[PDB]
């Protein structure tokens, strides 16, 4: 369940703009031993902090979007 | 062929080599997705293996020749 889940997640990540996907990966510790922050996204991408919050929001629109949601919907009952 | 494995042995000669060769072929087919020779007839890969070995289309020599040739031609394609 975890494996098929995670592969489906990455397959959703592939479809986005670059900064979107990479930010949303490292911001959550995905794909790494890291745990990087809004502030540190400031440090790496560019110091802008809360436009990253708005970008997170926009991506959550781009991806939640029930044409992609339904690979995730079985995991609602988790 | 399905219920009895005699004529296959009459082709090759041994149970053990028969199941090894057959398993080799049906692992070329269960995973490698290569096509059959005898028709399908709605049968799991066991039966098609045992048939292709029954009528004299698959053999350890023949598998060696096939994999050999495609491997070598691949080595030519790499260079």
């Amino acid at each position: 369940t975890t494996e098929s889940l995670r592969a489906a997640t990455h397959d959703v990540l592939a479809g986005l703009t670059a900064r979107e996907a990479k930010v949303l990966r490292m911001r959550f510790g995905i794909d790494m031993n890291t745990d990087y922050t809004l502030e540190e996204v400031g440090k790496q991408f560019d110091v802008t902090r809360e436009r990253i919050r708005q970008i997170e929001a926009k991506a959550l629109r781009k991806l939640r979007h029930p044409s992609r949601s339904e690979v995730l919907r079985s995991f609602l009952d988790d | 062929a399905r219920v009895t494995v005699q004529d296959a042995v009459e082709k090759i000669g041994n149970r053990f080599d028969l199941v090894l060769v057959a398993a080799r072929r049906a692992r070329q087919m269960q995973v490698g997705g290569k096509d059959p020779l005898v028709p399908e007839e709605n049968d799991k890969t066991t039966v098609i293996a045992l048939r292709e070995i029954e009528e004299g289309l698959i053999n350890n020599q023949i598998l060696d020749v096939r994999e050999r040739q495609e491997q070598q031609e691949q080595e030519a394609a790499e260079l």
Binding site: - | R2, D43, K44, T46
Partner: protein, 51 residues
């Protein structure tokens, strides 16, 4: 939920898929044999009397 395609797919996979049978005490090698499955609507195995 035990839907209909559950059963059709069960019959789909089971075909050509043998299965082993064993009775205690497994004295000699004919005490354990490989048959083919046949599905039936009951909780009791049937068997080929000669064996």
């Amino acid at each position: 939920r035990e839907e209909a395609v559950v059963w059709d797919i069960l019959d789909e996979v089971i075909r050509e898929h043998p299965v082993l049978l064993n009775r205690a005490p497994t004295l000699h090698r004919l005490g354990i044999q490989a048959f083919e499955p046949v599905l039936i609507e009951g909780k009791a195995i049937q068997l080929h009397p000669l064996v």
